[PDB]
Design a binder for these strands. Sequence first.
RNA 1: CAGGUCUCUCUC
RNA 2: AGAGAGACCU
Length: 462
Amino acid sequence: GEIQWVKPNKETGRLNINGPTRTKLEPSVFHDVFEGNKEPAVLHSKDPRLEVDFEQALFSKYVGNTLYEPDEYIKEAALHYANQLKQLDIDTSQMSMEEACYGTENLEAIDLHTSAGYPYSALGIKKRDILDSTTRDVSKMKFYMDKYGLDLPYSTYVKDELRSIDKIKKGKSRLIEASSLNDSVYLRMTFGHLYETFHANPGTVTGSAVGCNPDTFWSKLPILLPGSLFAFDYSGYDASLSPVWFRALELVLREIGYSEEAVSLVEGINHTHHVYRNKTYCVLGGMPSGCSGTSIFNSMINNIIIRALLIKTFKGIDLDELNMVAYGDDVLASYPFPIDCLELARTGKEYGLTMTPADKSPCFNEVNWDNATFLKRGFLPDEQFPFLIHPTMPMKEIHESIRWTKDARNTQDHVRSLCLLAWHNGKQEYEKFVSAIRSVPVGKALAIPNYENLRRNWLELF
RNA sequence: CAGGUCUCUCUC
RNA sequence: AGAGAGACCU
Ligand SMILES: [Mg+2]
Ligand SMILES: [Mg+2]
Ligand SMILES: [Zn+2]
């Protein structure tokens, strides 16, 4: 992706979109009980922790575009992947505006406690001033679709979250692009069924992990991915995507049977317009991180990508022996023979992709189930039942979370949730964690899940 | 102060 | 069916 032009909102006739500059995050009662190196992201340019220019850091993920049109390696990949999806028989018919707004069995409803985005966000209109979960009225939507139409600008906001202090130093906070509700709807009307299939079938057929549950899915992955493991993260995946991939996406959608006017919407997220404060900018390429289908389209593009890279990098590759699951830019894959990921990253560079070890190690080492990760979690065979696999969120990640809060009101829920992550690291670590929670007044007040109840409840999922 | 997922908690 | 929250990915 690459920013094409930037114009004053005076010149574009775009309403200013301004967001909060102070974080909700406050140290918690547990801040000094546990060790941690994270602090809230830089939200304002006059942040004293800054060592570089904020806004230039913010937008530096737009590294540019390489390809615009697929090459032969990428065409082949797109058609291999689309053939794989054919067996899912996706309903390419348009989803009803009702089901699009209020969801189905395999698709959540539009998030009503979230901004309606441009222009509503500046017109003081919330999503609930238009949508209503009880009525399931759609008519108020239709009037509004007609009024403002589609292809409405994305509202750029900086993301409130804990980041490493290196990334605070360098001001590399995360950008998200608030989608206008109109676009959200129309995309869900076009692809809601595809969403449904993908959510219902995490695994190696969709090649997506969206809609998986790590407590049960982790035991299937060593079976889903047999052979030699390999894995990736990207630095700045979303913005690094050149339009080629979006073209390649189009081919996939055409092949599985989308109409041409359905497939047309892909250029509307390839080529986007964004308002950040008092300016308007154009982005060519780059996934609007924050549109409908973000995680799915990322995951779909990833599947195209891996294949394209394999067959451009290595002789004798047979993509039928490829197993990969992807969650956005997260990849866990396997092949009958060890894959040299340093060479795939080389090829990645030529497509404008910056690829890294999934651990953000400084080099690519052998990947096996004892060091593999996915969605931050590791893989730990249960000591009693070795065929059942624990998802292991690192204690130091859990430690980072617990040290802050956006609202101490939820301390109970927050701590309980972390506990449900932490017990997979086994009895010893969990009581070490619990003891530490207990060593502060507020911890002794909290309802903390018993280890053996957790384990028994995990066992009975099977 | 976005798009999604999973899970938990509280209700009716 | 409604209200919280935490975590994950962009
Ligand atoms: Mg990344
Ligand atoms: Mg990642
Ligand atoms: Zn443009």
